[PDB]
Symmetry: D2
Subunit: 187 residues, 4 copies
C-alpha cells in the first residue's frame, strides 16, 4: 500500500491551491492501493515551523509523514514569480536527502499564465537538491480556470499529470534510495 | 541622503549571513552619505510574518522601511539550493512592485561552492518580479572562507560588489519609478 | 556618443524577434546621442560561429562590436522554454567578462505567454556570468500581439523597458569595468 | 532491447565531456540489454544544424535516432553558466514533444564547482519543455577531477547516477507517451 502526502503552501485562507492539491490526492487514491494525508503548511505552528522546532508534535508528525511517503504532491500558489516562502519554510526543515526514493508532482496556481515556468525553473531544482527519485511533469493552473471544474483541455492535462504521478509510484524496496547521490549512505 | 536597508534571512542564531550583510551595510555607509537599518527576518513575529499581518507594528515598520529604501542588501544562506523560506516569506509580503526605483545587492553564504548559482538563477528573478531598478552582481561566500576576515581574492570580489552597489544608488527623483513596467501607475 | 549593439537570434527568416530588436534600437537612437548596429546571428558563417573561428572577418567584427558597445539589446525567440541555441552560440564566443561596464536589455517573442520567465530565469543569469553592469527589465511579447503596432498596454511596457535601457547607459569612463568581479584585472 | 542515445555538445576537439558521455553510455550498455549511439553535435553539418535542414541525411539521422531512443544521455560542458549553444541548437530542431516516453541523464563538466546548478536550473527545464518522461539526477564533474579515472567519491556519485538512469529505462509500450501533456495527441 502506498503512502501519498500532499503539501500545500498558500498562506491564504480558502486556498484554490489547496483545493487543487486535494483533487490530485483524491484522484490518485481513487485509482491505486493508497492512503494519504494533506499537510496544509498554514496550519503548522508558525514559530516552530520557522525555527525547525521538532519538539512541536504536529510539525514533527508532518516531517515524519513526508519522509515516509512514496509520493509527494507539492502544491503552491505563485508568489513573486516563485513558490511561497511558507512552502519553502517547510521544505527547509526536511533532512538533506529527504526525498530519496520518492516520486513527486509539482502543482501550482497563479494569477497569470506568464509564470508557468516558476515550477520548472524554481521548485523543480529544490526537489532535486533533496535526492528526489522521480518528479513528473509540472501542472500550473490560472486562478480563473478553476471553479473536474475546468475547461476540458486544462482538465486533460491535469489528469494526465496526476495519472503519470500515480504510475511513477514504486512498490519495490529496491528503489527506496534511488535519487540519492550515495545510496549506501542512507536516504 | 540615501536610505540603505539590509535584509538577512537565516533562521539560525549566530548567522554568518547576517554578519556578511552587516559588513556590507557598514562598508556602504562608510563611503556614502547614507543611513541604514538591518532587518533580521528571524526577529519578526513568525505568525504575523507568515500571515502578512501588518497590524503587527514591527512587521509593518520593516515593510515600510524596505519600501522607502534607495538600496537593499538582500542576504540569505543557501538552503536546499535556493534562498531560505524565511527570507522569501518576508519578500512575499511586500507590495507587487515594491522594488521600483531601488538598487539591490544579492549576498549569500553556503556550505558548498556548488550552489553559487542559486543567487542568479533563484533570487535574482524574484527581485525582478518586483520592478527592481538595478540588481548588481551577486556575491556568494563558502562558510569556511569567513572568520575583512577572508582570503584576499574573496575580499576583493566582495568589496567590488559592495562598491558597485553603492555606486548604483540614485540621488535623483527622476529614477524613483524605473524598473516598474508602468511607471505612471506608481511603484 | 554611445555605441548600441542589437543581437537577435532567431534562426528563422522573416524574424518577428529581429523586428522587435530593430524597433528597440531605433527607439534608443531617436532619443540619445548614439550610433548602432544590429548583429543578426543567422547571418554569421555557421561553421565559423560554432567553431569560434575569429579568422572569419565578419564574425570577428561582430565580436569586436559587441565588446565595444555601451549597451546591448539582446533578443531571442523562445525555443524549448529558453533562448535559442543560435543566440547562445554567439554569446559563447565572447570573452569571459565580455559585458563588463555594459548596460543590457533582454527581449523575446514567443508563441505562448506561458514562457515569459525564460528571459529572467534563463538569459539573465548568462549575461551575469559575463560581468554585465546593468541588465534592466526583460520584455516578452506573444507572437500575435505584434503586427508601434501593438496593444497600448503592451506598447507602454515595451517603451518603458527601452526608455530604462537608454537611461541606464553610461557616459563616464569610471563605469567601464563595473560588473566585473576584479575590475583591475580588466574587463 | 533498449536504444540508448548519447548527445554531447562541446564545440571543442578532444572533449572531456564527450569522454564522460562515452563512459556513461558504455556503463549502461554493459549492464542492460541495450544498443547505443553517440551523437557528437560538433560533427553535424553546422549550416544544416543551425537551419534545421533535415534534407541533410546525417542531421536527419541524428534527429530520428534521438526520437527513437528509450533513454538519452545529454552531456555538455558549462559555457557562460549554462549548456552550450551548440547543444541547444541540436535540441532546438527536435519535435515539440520529442522526449515523450523517454528517460534522461544530464551530465556536465566545468572548470569550476561554482556552476554545478547550471544543469538543474538550466538544462532540466528545457528537457521538460519536450515532454520528457523521467530525468534522473544530474551529474557534474570539475575538469581536473577527470583523467574509472577519478576520486572514489566522485566515481560513486557518477556510477550511481548512471545506475539510476539505466534502472529508469522502460520496456513497456504503456509508458511510450508518458510525460506528454496530451498523450493521445501523440508524442
Ligand atoms: N501576459 C499574460 O499572459 C497576461 C497576464 N494577465 C494577468 O492576469 C491578471 C488578472 O488577475 P488578478 O485580478 O490580478 O488576480 P490575481 O490572482 O493575480 O491576484 C490576486 C491578488 O493578489 C494580488 N497580487 C497579485 N500579484 C501580486 C504580487 N506580485 N504581489 C503582491 N500581491 C499580488 C493582487 O493584487 C490580487 O489582489 C491581470 O491582472 C494580469 O496581471 C492578464 C492577461 C494576460
Ligand atoms: N563540489 C564541491 O565543490 C564541494 C562541496 N563540498 C561540500 O562542502 C561540505 C563541508 O561543509 P559542511 O560541514 O557540510 O557545512 P555546511 O555549512 O554545509 O552544513 C551546515 C549544517 O547544515 C546541514 N546541512 C547541510 N546541508 C543541508 C541540507 N541540504 N539540508 C539540511 N541540512 C543541511 C549540515 O548537516 C550541517 O550540519 C562538504 O560536506 C561538501 O558537501 C566539499 C568539497 C567540494
Ligand atoms: N497557458 C497559456 O497561456 C496559453 C498558451 N497558448 C499557446 O498559444 C499557442 C498558439 O500559437 P502557435 O500557433 O503555436 O504559434 P507559435 O508561434 O507558438 O508556433 C510557431 C511554430 O513553431 C512550432 N512550435 C511551437 N512550439 C514548438 C516547439 N516547442 N518545438 C518545435 N516547434 C514548435 C509550431 O508548430 C508552429 O509551427 C497555442 O498553440 C498554445 O500553445 C494558448 C493559449 C493559452
Ligand atoms: N568558487 C569556487 O569553487 C572555485 C572556482 N575555481 C575556478 O577554477 C578555475 C581553474 O580552471 P581553469 O584553468 O580556468 O580551467 P577551465 O576549464 O575553467 O577553463 C578552460 C579554458 O576556457 C576558458 N574559459 C573559462 N571560462 C570561460 C568563459 N566564461 N568564457 C570564455 N572562456 C572561458 C579559460 O580561459 C580556459 O582557457 C579557476 O580559474 C577558478 O575560476 C577555483 C577555485 C574555487
Ligand atoms: C502576495 C502575492 C503575490 C503574488 N504573486 C504572483 C505572481 O508573481 N505571479 C502570478 O501569476 N500570481 C501571483 N499571485 C496571484 C496568486 O498566485 C493567485 O491568486 C493564486 O491562485 C492564489 O492561490 P491560493 O488561493 O491557494 O492562495 C500573487 C498573489 C499574492 C497574494
Ligand atoms: C537546512 C539546511 C539546508 C542547507 N542547504 C544547503 C545547500 O543546499 N547548499 C549549500 O551550499 N549549503 C546548504 N546549507 C549550509 C548553509 O548554507 C551554510 O551553513 C550557511 O553558511 C549558513 O549560514 P547562517 O550562519 O547565516 O545560517 C544548508 C544548511 C541547512 C541548515
Ligand atoms: C523549434 C521551435 C520551438 C519553439 N519553442 C517555443 C517555446 O518553447 N515557447 C514559446 O512560447 N514559443 C515557442 N516557439 C514559438 C516561437 O517562440 C515564436 O513563434 C516566435 O515569435 C518566433 O520568433 P521569430 O519570428 O523571430 O523566429 C517555438 C518555435 C519553434 C520553431
Ligand atoms: C567559452 C568557454 C566558456 C566557459 N564557461 C564556463 C563557465 O561558465 N563555468 C565553468 O565552470 N566552466 C566554464 N568553461 C570551462 C569548461 O566548462 C571546461 O573546460 C569543460 O570541462 C570543457 O569541456 P570539453 O573538454 O568537453 O570541451 C568555459 C570554457 C569555455 C571555452
Amino acid at each position: 500500500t502506498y503512502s501519498i502526502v500532499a503539501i500545500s503552501g498558500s498562506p491564504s485562507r480558502n486556498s484554490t491551491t489547496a483545493k487543487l492539491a486535494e483533487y490530485a490526492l483524491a484522484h490518485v487514491l481513487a485509482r491505486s492501493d493508497s492512503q494519504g494525508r494533506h499537510i496544509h503548511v498554514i496550519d503548522l505552528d508558525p514559530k516552530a515551523l520557522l525555527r525547525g522546532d521538532l519538539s512541536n508534535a504536529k510539525l514533527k508528525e508532518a516531517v515524519d509523514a513526508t519522509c515516509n511517503a512514496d509520493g509527494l504532491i507539492v502544491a503552491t500558489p505563485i508568489y513573486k514569480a516563485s513558490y511561497t516562502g511558507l512552502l519553502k519554510a517547510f521544505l527547509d526543515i526536511l533532512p538533506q536527502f529527504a526525498l530519496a526514493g520518492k516520486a513527486a508532482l509539482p502543482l501550482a496556481t497563479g494569477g497569470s499564465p506568464a509564470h508557468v515556468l516558476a515550477l520548472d525553473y524554481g521548485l523543480r531544482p529544490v526537489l532535486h537538491s533533496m535526492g528526489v527519485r522521480h518528479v513528473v511533469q509540472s501542472f500550473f493552473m490560472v486562478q480563473s480556470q478553476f471553479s473536474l471544474a475546468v475547461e476540458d483541455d486544462v482538465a486533460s492535462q491535469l489528469n494526465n499529470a496526476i495519472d503519470h504521478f500515480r504510475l511513477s509510484l514504486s512498490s519495490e524496496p529496491s528503489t527506496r534510495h534511488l535519487g540519492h547521490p550515495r545510496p549506501s549512505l542512507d536516504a
